[PDB]
Short mmCIF file of all heavy atoms in Angstrom, two decimals:
data_model
loop_
_atom_site.label_atom_id
_atom_site.label_comp_id
_atom_site.label_asym_id
_atom_site.label_seq_id
_atom_site.Cartn_x
_atom_site.Cartn_y
_atom_site.Cartn_z
N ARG A 1 -42.35 24.52 55.60
CA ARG A 1 -42.48 24.88 56.97
C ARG A 1 -41.08 24.82 57.64
O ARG A 1 -40.41 23.73 57.61
CB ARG A 1 -43.39 23.93 57.73
CG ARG A 1 -43.95 24.61 58.99
CD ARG A 1 -44.66 23.66 59.86
NE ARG A 1 -43.80 22.81 60.71
CZ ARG A 1 -44.23 22.16 61.81
NH1 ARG A 1 -45.46 22.22 62.25
NH2 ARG A 1 -43.28 21.53 62.51
N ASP A 2 -40.66 25.93 58.23
CA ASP A 2 -39.28 26.00 58.81
C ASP A 2 -39.34 25.73 60.28
O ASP A 2 -40.26 26.12 61.01
CB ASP A 2 -38.74 27.48 58.58
CG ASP A 2 -38.50 27.78 57.12
OD1 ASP A 2 -38.84 26.98 56.26
OD2 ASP A 2 -37.98 28.83 56.82
N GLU A 3 -38.36 24.92 60.75
CA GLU A 3 -38.11 24.70 62.14
C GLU A 3 -36.92 25.57 62.57
O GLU A 3 -36.22 26.07 61.62
CB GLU A 3 -37.72 23.21 62.35
CG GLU A 3 -38.41 22.55 63.57
CD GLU A 3 -39.84 22.15 63.32
OE1 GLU A 3 -40.27 21.86 62.25
OE2 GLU A 3 -40.61 22.05 64.36
N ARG A 4 -36.72 25.81 63.83
CA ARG A 4 -35.58 26.66 64.31
C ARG A 4 -34.88 26.15 65.56
O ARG A 4 -35.39 25.32 66.34
CB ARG A 4 -36.03 28.10 64.56
CG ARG A 4 -37.27 28.29 65.47
CD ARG A 4 -36.92 28.50 66.93
NE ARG A 4 -36.50 29.90 67.20
CZ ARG A 4 -36.84 30.63 68.27
NH1 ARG A 4 -37.67 30.19 69.22
NH2 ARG A 4 -36.36 31.88 68.41
N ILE A 5 -33.68 26.65 65.78
CA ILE A 5 -32.93 26.47 67.05
C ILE A 5 -32.30 27.86 67.31
O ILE A 5 -31.58 28.39 66.44
CB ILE A 5 -31.89 25.36 66.97
CG1 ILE A 5 -31.12 25.26 68.36
CG2 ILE A 5 -30.88 25.58 65.89
CD1 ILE A 5 -32.04 24.84 69.51
N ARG A 6 -32.69 28.50 68.41
CA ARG A 6 -32.21 29.89 68.77
C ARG A 6 -32.57 30.84 67.54
O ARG A 6 -33.67 30.94 67.22
CB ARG A 6 -30.78 29.87 69.18
CG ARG A 6 -30.49 28.91 70.37
CD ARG A 6 -31.47 29.02 71.50
NE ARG A 6 -31.03 28.21 72.65
CZ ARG A 6 -30.18 28.58 73.62
NH1 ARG A 6 -29.54 29.75 73.57
NH2 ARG A 6 -29.85 27.76 74.62
N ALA A 7 -31.51 31.44 66.88
CA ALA A 7 -31.73 32.32 65.77
C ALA A 7 -31.53 31.62 64.36
O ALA A 7 -31.79 32.28 63.38
CB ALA A 7 -30.78 33.51 65.80
N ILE A 8 -31.17 30.36 64.43
CA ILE A 8 -30.86 29.59 63.12
C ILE A 8 -32.22 28.99 62.70
O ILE A 8 -33.05 28.63 63.47
CB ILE A 8 -29.86 28.48 63.44
CG1 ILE A 8 -28.54 29.05 64.01
CG2 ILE A 8 -29.57 27.68 62.22
CD1 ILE A 8 -27.77 29.94 63.05
N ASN A 9 -32.35 28.84 61.34
CA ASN A 9 -33.56 28.23 60.73
C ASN A 9 -33.12 27.19 59.71
O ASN A 9 -32.10 27.25 59.10
CB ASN A 9 -34.37 29.32 60.07
CG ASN A 9 -34.64 30.46 61.00
OD1 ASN A 9 -35.26 30.28 61.98
ND2 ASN A 9 -34.15 31.65 60.57
N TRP A 10 -34.02 26.22 59.45
CA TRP A 10 -33.84 25.22 58.41
C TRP A 10 -35.28 24.74 57.86
O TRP A 10 -36.30 25.09 58.47
CB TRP A 10 -33.02 24.05 58.80
CG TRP A 10 -33.63 23.09 59.82
CD1 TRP A 10 -34.39 21.95 59.56
CD2 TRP A 10 -33.65 23.21 61.29
NE1 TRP A 10 -34.77 21.38 60.71
CE2 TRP A 10 -34.29 22.12 61.79
CE3 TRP A 10 -33.10 24.10 62.17
CZ2 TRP A 10 -34.55 21.87 63.15
CZ3 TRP A 10 -33.30 23.96 63.52
CH2 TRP A 10 -33.99 22.89 64.02
N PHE A 11 -35.25 24.17 56.75
CA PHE A 11 -36.50 23.74 56.08
C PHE A 11 -36.95 22.30 56.47
O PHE A 11 -36.24 21.38 56.19
CB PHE A 11 -36.31 23.77 54.53
CG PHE A 11 -35.66 25.05 54.08
CD1 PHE A 11 -34.46 24.99 53.45
CD2 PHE A 11 -36.24 26.27 54.27
CE1 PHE A 11 -33.74 26.13 53.01
CE2 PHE A 11 -35.63 27.44 53.84
CZ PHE A 11 -34.41 27.36 53.26
N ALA A 12 -38.08 22.20 57.20
CA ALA A 12 -38.50 20.94 57.71
C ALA A 12 -39.38 20.18 56.84
O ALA A 12 -39.14 19.07 56.50
CB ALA A 12 -39.17 21.18 59.10
N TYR A 13 -40.50 20.83 56.34
CA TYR A 13 -41.51 20.23 55.49
C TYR A 13 -41.63 20.93 54.15
O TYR A 13 -41.12 22.01 53.97
CB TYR A 13 -42.82 20.26 56.26
CG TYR A 13 -42.80 19.35 57.47
CD1 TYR A 13 -42.56 19.86 58.76
CD2 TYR A 13 -42.95 17.94 57.30
CE1 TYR A 13 -42.44 19.04 59.82
CE2 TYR A 13 -42.96 17.20 58.47
CZ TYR A 13 -42.67 17.69 59.70
OH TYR A 13 -42.69 16.89 60.79
N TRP A 14 -42.29 20.20 53.24
CA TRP A 14 -42.45 20.67 51.87
C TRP A 14 -43.90 20.33 51.34
O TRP A 14 -44.59 19.46 51.93
CB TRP A 14 -41.50 19.94 50.88
CG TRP A 14 -40.12 20.58 50.76
CD1 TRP A 14 -39.69 21.41 49.74
CD2 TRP A 14 -38.97 20.40 51.59
NE1 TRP A 14 -38.35 21.75 49.93
CE2 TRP A 14 -37.94 21.13 51.09
CE3 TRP A 14 -38.78 19.61 52.84
CZ2 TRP A 14 -36.65 21.15 51.70
CZ3 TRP A 14 -37.53 19.71 53.40
CH2 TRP A 14 -36.42 20.41 52.84
N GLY A 15 -44.29 21.05 50.31
CA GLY A 15 -45.49 20.71 49.59
C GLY A 15 -45.05 19.98 48.27
O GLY A 15 -43.83 20.02 47.96
N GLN A 16 -45.95 19.39 47.49
CA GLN A 16 -45.62 18.70 46.27
C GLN A 16 -44.83 19.54 45.33
O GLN A 16 -43.91 19.13 44.70
CB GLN A 16 -46.99 18.29 45.63
CG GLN A 16 -46.82 17.39 44.40
CD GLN A 16 -47.77 17.66 43.27
OE1 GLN A 16 -48.61 18.55 43.31
NE2 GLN A 16 -47.70 16.89 42.13
N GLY A 17 -45.32 20.70 45.13
CA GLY A 17 -44.64 21.76 44.25
C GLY A 17 -45.64 22.35 43.25
O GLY A 17 -46.83 22.15 43.35
N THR A 18 -45.11 23.13 42.33
CA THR A 18 -45.80 23.68 41.15
C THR A 18 -44.80 24.01 40.10
O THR A 18 -43.89 24.77 40.34
CB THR A 18 -46.56 24.97 41.54
OG1 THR A 18 -47.53 24.75 42.67
CG2 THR A 18 -47.41 25.48 40.31
N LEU A 19 -45.04 23.50 38.88
CA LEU A 19 -44.26 23.81 37.73
C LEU A 19 -44.67 25.16 37.22
O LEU A 19 -45.84 25.38 37.05
CB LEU A 19 -44.34 22.76 36.65
CG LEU A 19 -43.16 22.74 35.62
CD1 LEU A 19 -41.83 22.40 36.23
CD2 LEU A 19 -43.51 21.80 34.50
N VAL A 20 -43.73 26.07 36.96
CA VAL A 20 -43.98 27.42 36.36
C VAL A 20 -42.94 27.66 35.25
O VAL A 20 -41.72 27.59 35.42
CB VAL A 20 -43.86 28.50 37.49
CG1 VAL A 20 -43.85 29.85 36.94
CG2 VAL A 20 -44.88 28.32 38.54
N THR A 21 -43.53 27.97 34.07
CA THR A 21 -42.77 28.09 32.81
C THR A 21 -43.10 29.43 32.18
O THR A 21 -44.26 29.84 32.20
CB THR A 21 -42.99 26.88 31.87
OG1 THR A 21 -42.39 27.12 30.61
CG2 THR A 21 -44.50 26.54 31.77
N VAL A 22 -42.11 30.08 31.67
CA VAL A 22 -42.14 31.48 31.24
C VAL A 22 -41.91 31.56 29.72
O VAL A 22 -40.78 31.61 29.22
CB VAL A 22 -41.12 32.41 31.93
CG1 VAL A 22 -41.27 33.81 31.45
CG2 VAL A 22 -41.32 32.33 33.46
N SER A 23 -43.00 31.54 28.91
CA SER A 23 -42.99 31.67 27.47
C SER A 23 -44.23 32.33 27.02
O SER A 23 -45.34 32.17 27.59
CB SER A 23 -42.81 30.31 26.78
OG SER A 23 -42.72 30.43 25.39
N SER A 24 -44.19 33.05 25.86
CA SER A 24 -45.26 33.76 25.25
C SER A 24 -46.38 32.91 24.69
O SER A 24 -47.49 33.42 24.43
CB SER A 24 -44.72 34.75 24.16
OG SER A 24 -43.72 35.64 24.73
N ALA A 25 -46.09 31.68 24.26
CA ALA A 25 -46.91 30.79 23.57
C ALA A 25 -48.29 30.56 24.29
O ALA A 25 -48.46 30.73 25.44
CB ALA A 25 -46.30 29.41 23.41
N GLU A 26 -49.36 30.32 23.43
CA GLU A 26 -50.70 30.22 23.88
C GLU A 26 -50.91 28.86 24.60
O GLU A 26 -50.28 27.89 24.22
CB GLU A 26 -51.71 30.39 22.73
CG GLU A 26 -53.09 30.78 23.14
CD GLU A 26 -53.39 32.19 23.35
OE1 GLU A 26 -52.46 32.98 23.68
OE2 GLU A 26 -54.54 32.66 23.35
N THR A 27 -51.76 28.83 25.60
CA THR A 27 -52.14 27.58 26.31
C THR A 27 -52.99 26.71 25.33
O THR A 27 -54.14 27.08 25.00
CB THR A 27 -52.94 27.85 27.59
OG1 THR A 27 -54.11 28.62 27.23
CG2 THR A 27 -52.10 28.54 28.60
N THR A 28 -52.42 25.61 24.94
CA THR A 28 -52.99 24.74 23.87
C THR A 28 -53.83 23.65 24.51
O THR A 28 -53.45 23.10 25.52
CB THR A 28 -51.90 24.11 22.96
OG1 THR A 28 -50.78 25.10 22.75
CG2 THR A 28 -52.51 23.65 21.68
N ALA A 29 -54.94 23.31 23.80
CA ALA A 29 -55.87 22.26 24.32
C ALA A 29 -55.40 20.89 23.94
O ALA A 29 -55.01 20.68 22.76
CB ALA A 29 -57.24 22.53 23.71
N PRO A 30 -55.35 19.93 24.91
CA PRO A 30 -54.84 18.57 24.59
C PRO A 30 -55.85 17.80 23.65
O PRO A 30 -56.97 18.25 23.36
CB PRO A 30 -54.76 17.89 26.01
CG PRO A 30 -55.70 18.66 26.79
CD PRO A 30 -55.68 20.09 26.36
N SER A 31 -55.37 16.67 23.13
CA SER A 31 -56.15 15.75 22.39
C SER A 31 -55.94 14.40 22.91
O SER A 31 -54.75 13.86 22.95
CB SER A 31 -55.78 15.81 20.92
OG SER A 31 -55.86 17.11 20.40
N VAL A 32 -56.96 13.76 23.45
CA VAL A 32 -56.88 12.43 23.97
C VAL A 32 -57.55 11.38 23.09
O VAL A 32 -58.79 11.36 23.01
CB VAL A 32 -57.51 12.35 25.43
CG1 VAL A 32 -57.44 10.92 26.00
CG2 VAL A 32 -56.83 13.36 26.34
N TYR A 33 -56.75 10.68 22.33
CA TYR A 33 -57.21 9.64 21.43
C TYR A 33 -57.07 8.24 22.19
O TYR A 33 -56.18 8.08 23.01
CB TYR A 33 -56.35 9.57 20.10
CG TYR A 33 -56.34 10.85 19.39
CD1 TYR A 33 -55.22 11.67 19.40
CD2 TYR A 33 -57.44 11.33 18.62
CE1 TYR A 33 -55.14 12.90 18.70
CE2 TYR A 33 -57.40 12.50 17.95
CZ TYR A 33 -56.19 13.26 17.96
OH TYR A 33 -56.18 14.50 17.23
N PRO A 34 -57.92 7.27 21.77
CA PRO A 34 -57.86 5.93 22.43
C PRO A 34 -56.81 4.98 21.66
O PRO A 34 -56.62 5.19 20.49
CB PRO A 34 -59.28 5.42 22.16
CG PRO A 34 -59.66 5.96 20.89
CD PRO A 34 -59.05 7.37 20.77
N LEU A 35 -56.29 4.03 22.43
CA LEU A 35 -55.46 3.03 21.91
C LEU A 35 -55.98 1.66 22.34
O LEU A 35 -55.93 1.30 23.56
CB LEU A 35 -54.00 3.19 22.43
CG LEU A 35 -53.35 4.55 22.28
CD1 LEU A 35 -52.10 4.74 23.09
CD2 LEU A 35 -53.14 4.91 20.76
N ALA A 36 -56.45 0.86 21.36
CA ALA A 36 -57.00 -0.51 21.60
C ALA A 36 -56.43 -1.50 20.58
O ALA A 36 -56.33 -1.15 19.42
CB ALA A 36 -58.49 -0.46 21.47
N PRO A 37 -56.15 -2.70 21.02
CA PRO A 37 -55.52 -3.71 20.13
C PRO A 37 -56.50 -4.32 19.10
O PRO A 37 -57.70 -4.22 19.22
CB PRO A 37 -55.04 -4.80 21.13
CG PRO A 37 -56.08 -4.75 22.21
CD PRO A 37 -56.46 -3.33 22.32
N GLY A 38 -55.93 -4.92 18.07
CA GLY A 38 -56.73 -5.59 16.99
C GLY A 38 -57.00 -7.05 17.31
O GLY A 38 -58.20 -7.39 17.42
N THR A 39 -55.97 -7.87 17.36
CA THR A 39 -56.08 -9.30 17.65
C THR A 39 -56.25 -9.61 19.13
O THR A 39 -55.72 -8.83 20.00
CB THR A 39 -54.84 -10.02 17.07
OG1 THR A 39 -54.58 -9.70 15.72
CG2 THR A 39 -55.10 -11.59 17.16
N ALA A 40 -56.97 -10.68 19.48
CA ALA A 40 -57.13 -11.18 20.79
C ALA A 40 -56.73 -12.70 20.84
O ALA A 40 -57.43 -13.50 20.44
CB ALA A 40 -58.60 -10.94 21.24
N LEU A 41 -55.52 -12.88 21.47
CA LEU A 41 -54.96 -14.25 21.48
C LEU A 41 -55.64 -15.23 22.47
O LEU A 41 -56.38 -16.12 22.09
CB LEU A 41 -53.44 -14.24 21.69
CG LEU A 41 -52.57 -13.63 20.56
CD1 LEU A 41 -51.18 -13.39 21.04
CD2 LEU A 41 -52.48 -14.51 19.34
N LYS A 42 -55.36 -15.02 23.75
CA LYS A 42 -55.82 -15.95 24.77
C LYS A 42 -56.67 -15.16 25.85
O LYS A 42 -56.74 -13.97 25.92
CB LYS A 42 -54.56 -16.51 25.52
CG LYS A 42 -53.94 -17.66 24.69
CD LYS A 42 -52.89 -18.50 25.52
CE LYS A 42 -51.63 -17.61 25.81
NZ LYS A 42 -50.90 -17.26 24.60
#
């Protein structure tokens, strides 16, 4: 969102953003495996 003074402008506010990447590769499905410990001390 731009603010102004007379004919001059500047950038006042922003949004979080969006990452945009340019490659031919296929959108790959993630794999979420669990991580849990063996021993329990205290």
Side-chain angles (χ1 to χ4, degrees):
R1 201 190 85 161
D2 294 5
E3 222 80 27
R4 54 93 77 139
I5 181 64
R6 306 312 187 83
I8 303 292
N9 312 298
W10 71 94
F11 314 114
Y13 293 97
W14 275 260
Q16 186 220 1
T18 304
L19 199 66
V20 171
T21 170
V22 182
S23 184
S24 303
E26 199 82 341
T27 56
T28 321
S31 305
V32 180
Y33 305 106
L35 309 167
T39 310
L41 292 167
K42 285 189 288 297

